Design a protein around this ligand. Structure first.
Ligand SMILES: Cc1cc2nc3c(=O)[nH]c(=O)nc-3n(C[C@H](O)[C@H](O)[C@H](O)COP(=O)(O)OP(=O)(O)OC[C@H]3O[C@@H](n4cnc5c(N)ncnc54)[C@H](O)[C@@H]3O)c2cc1C
Length: 456
DNA sequence: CGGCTTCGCGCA
DNA sequence: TGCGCGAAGCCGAT
């Protein structure tokens, strides 16, 4: 579909048909940004070829009721800033509400759209909406991978067992797909309220807030400022101040040495490809360079690979054969402690470091990367069944994490609980052959006591 | 056969 | 803290 600085492998056809004489419509779902957006850039390319400007649509689904205010305000505030950035380029953004399978298909008919383009997401709920709107339209369906540097259907054609088998595949395609983003061209001709949906939603999830003893909200919303502009400042501060000391302090939660990009990376408010471009050109510690790149290239995009080829990514069936047999044998093992969902949620466990890990999650909305494994592995060790452990982990992850409901989370949880993209270890009770993490192991690697006192 | 993200453990 | 080893199952280059 035309284009010079345009790789056709980033885009794939989902439904062929006659191209309508109306404007092309971009169904923004996962990448909520104007700059460095392949799906938006590709929508403008066909816009110029057909001499019809691009319009952007968005559907607000009730999946927000499953999460909390922290993710709702972080997402709506970025959309208000996005609405004014697209308006400066003469690109109108339309914010629908309801079922995407019935609202997107309808909006195509009333607006008489000429071409429909959407972003890529390996989640189950994304494929269900696509199959419904396909059966209700006749204009094309082009799906562009604007999140990953290398498209998911191009990086690997099967479920990759681990990273050492996926690392060479990704790095070999890097010189072809790691490129610079062309500038978003504004529209030639020009031819639902964000302020009201925010206040309507907030009053809905108000009773479901996470409160303290004195009816005080636990969440602290001054840690991460949402938006595209604020996301860029986070990257520049990470590269200039934290990139050098990443490789040595990436596993220490007492020091804020992480990029803190996951909330912006999940909602699409910042492009991972842009971060790699700025990182690759940066002159920093080579050890820290590869360590950060492997996290945002190999492990970030294997999560999409795991959720794209395994529909049951959040279930016990996606676990490898060795892990399923080990956990099935240890189902009758007596657990040293048994905690329900309410006790895990409120930090009512005998482990102060697990409670501190939960306390950081409740207050800041972003647990440290290293403590997320201990927070997840101890859940399996202190649960009725491996299914109940997976139930609690996903529920507590998708509810309070600013980067929840992401393939990065489902793959990360399956690694800690089901050994996905991992190997077997010493045989233990309850845990089985799954990788084991202990309190004493954490004490020798970082100052645990400093982590506890910070979060009570 | 070699080697696996992030494991624990003994010992400078 | 930093290093080498242990315990475990299996992909994939041959
Ligand atoms: C049990 C568990 C649950 C997780 N839940 C989520 C989640 O809900 N949402 C989420 O985005 N990630 C999740 N992670 C993955 C990882 O912990 C986070 O991406 C990271 O901690 C976010 O902090 P950061 O961006 O500052 O880390 P950084 O060190 O700055 O990481 C840079 C980027 O690399 C990617 N990345 C980092 N660590 C991992 C990892 N272990 N696996 C895959 N990609 C990674 C992310 O895109 C991240 O933004 C989870 C991991 C585990 C083990």
């Amino acid at each position: 579909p035309r284009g010079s600085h345009m790789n056709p492998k980033r885009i794939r056809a989902l439904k062929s048909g006659k191209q309508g004489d109306g404007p092309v419509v971009y169904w923004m779902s996962r990448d909520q940004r104007a700059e460095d957006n392949w799906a938006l850039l590709f929508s403008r390319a066909i816009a110029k070829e057909a001499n019809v400007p691009v319009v952007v649509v968005f559907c607000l689904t009730d999946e927000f009721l499953e999460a909390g205010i922290r993710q709702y305000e972080f997402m709506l505030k970025g959309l208000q800033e996005l609405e004014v950035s697209l308006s400066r380029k003469k690109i109108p953004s339309f914010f629908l509400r309801g079922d995407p399978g019935e609202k997107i298909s309808r909006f195509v008919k009333d607006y008489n759209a000429g071409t429909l383009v959407t972003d890529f997401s390996p989640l189950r709920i994304k494929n269900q909406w696509i199959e419904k709107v396909i059966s209700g339209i006749s204009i094309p369906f082009f799906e562009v991978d604007a999140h990953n540097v290398v498209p998911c259907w191009e990086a690997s054609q099967k479920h990759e067992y681990a990273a050492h088998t996926f690392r060479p595949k990704l790095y070999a395609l890097l010189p072809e797909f790691l490129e610079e983003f062309p500038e978003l061209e504004p529209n030639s001709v020009t031819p639902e309220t964000l302020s009201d949906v925010l206040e309507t939603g907030v009053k809905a999830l108000l009773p479901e807030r996470a409160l303290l003893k004195n009816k005080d909200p636990l969440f602290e919303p001054w840690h991460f400022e949402p938006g595209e502009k604020a996301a860029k400042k986070v990257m520049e501060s990470f590269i200039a101040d934290r990139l050098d000391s990443y490789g040595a302090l990436r596993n220490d939660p007492t020091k804020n040495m992480l990029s803190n990009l996951s909330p912006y990376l999940h909602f699409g408010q910042i492009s991972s490809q842009r971060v790699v471009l700025e990182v690759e050109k940066a002159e920093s510690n080579p050890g820290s360079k590869k360590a950060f790149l492997d996290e945002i290239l190999i492990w970030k995009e294997i999560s999409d690979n795991f959720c794209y080829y395994n529909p049951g990514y959040d279930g016990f069936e996606s676990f490898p054969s060795w892990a399923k047999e080990s956990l099935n044998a240890h189902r009758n093992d007596v657990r040293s402690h048994i905690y329900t969902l309410e006790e895990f949620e409120a930090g009512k466990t005998h482990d102060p470091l697990w409670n501190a890990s939960q306390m950081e999650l409740l207050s800041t909305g972003k647990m440290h990367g290293y403590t997320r494994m201990y927070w997840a592995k101890k859940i399996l060790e202190w649960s009725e069944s491996p299914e109940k452990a997976l139930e609690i982990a996903i529920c507590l992850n998708d509810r309070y994490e600013l980067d929840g409901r992401d393939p990065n989370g489902y793959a990360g949880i399956a690694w800690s609980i089901g050994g996905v993209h991992d190997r077997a270890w010493g045989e233990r009770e309850v845990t089985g052959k799954i990788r084991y993490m202990s309190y004493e192991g954490c004490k020798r690697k970082f100052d645990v006591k400093l982590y506890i006192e910070k979060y009570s």
